[PDB]
Amino acid sequence: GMQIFVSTAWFCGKLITLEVEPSDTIENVKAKIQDKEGIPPDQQRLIFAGKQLEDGRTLSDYNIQKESGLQLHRRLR
Amino acid sequence: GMQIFVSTAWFCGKLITLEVEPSDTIENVKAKIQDKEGIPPDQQRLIFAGKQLEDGRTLSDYNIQKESGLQLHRRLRP
C-alpha cells in the first residue's frame, strides 16, 4: 500500500485575463471578479510573488507592470 | 490602460487523496480519480515531479514514495 496525492489546480483552475487601470487598492481589487467570475471579495486570498497583501493597499507597494499574473487562493474570513 | 492576468489554479483547485500500491501504473490512479473526482483518463495529463509521464510504465520506475503529490493537467488531444 501507498498513499498518493493529486493536484487539480492546473486542471480546475482558470487563466483569466483582466483589464483595469492602475488606480486600484487591494480592497477594491478583489471585487472585479464578481462581475467576471462572480465571487464576493471575502474568500479571495491574493498572493503575489512571495508575500500576500493587506487590504486597500496600492499596486506600487507591490510593483505590478503590464501583462502580469497573480496567484489566486481561497480564504476563510 | 494595461493588460494583466490572474490564475485561479489554487483557488478553484482541490487536493485529493489516493492510496494504491507503488508497483501500479498510471491509468489506475487516473481511473482512481475518475472513481474519486470523475474525469476521463484521456483528458487527464498527469505530471509527477520532473517528467511528463505516460501510462503503462511502472510507477516504480518513477520512485513515488507514500504520501506523494501529482499535478493533474487537462488534455487537449493526443
Experimental method: X-ray
Q: What is the DSSP letter of A9?
A: H
Query: Do residue B44 and residue A1 have CB atoms under 8 angstroms apart?
Result: no
Q: Range of A20's domain?
A: 1-77
Structurally, how many domains does chain A consist of? Answer: 1
HSE at residue B43, side-chain half, CA atoms within 13 A, is 10
* Chain A residue nearest residue B64, CA to CA: A4
Q: What 3-state class would DSSP assign to A21?
A: coil
Q: Please list, in sequence order, all residues whose beta carbon lies within 8 angstroms of the beta carbon of residue B37, skipping any fewer than 6 positions away.
A: A8, B14, B16
CA of B64 vs chain A CAs: smallest distance (Å)? 8
Contact flag A8-B37 (C-beta cutoff 8 Å)? yes
Nearest CA-CA distance, residue A5 and chain B, Å: 4
Burial classification of residue A13, based on how many CB atoms lie within 10 Å of its CB (0-12 exposed, 13-18 middle, 19 or more buried)? buried
To which residue does cell 487527464 refer? B44
Q: What would the 3-class secondary structure string for chain B be?
A: CCCEEEECHHHHCCEEEEECCCCCCHHHHHHHHHHHCCCCCCCEEEECCCCCCCCCCCHHHHCCCCCEEEEEEECCCC
C-alpha cell at position A75: 480564504
- Among candidates A23, A30, A20, A27, which has minimal Cα distance to A56? A27
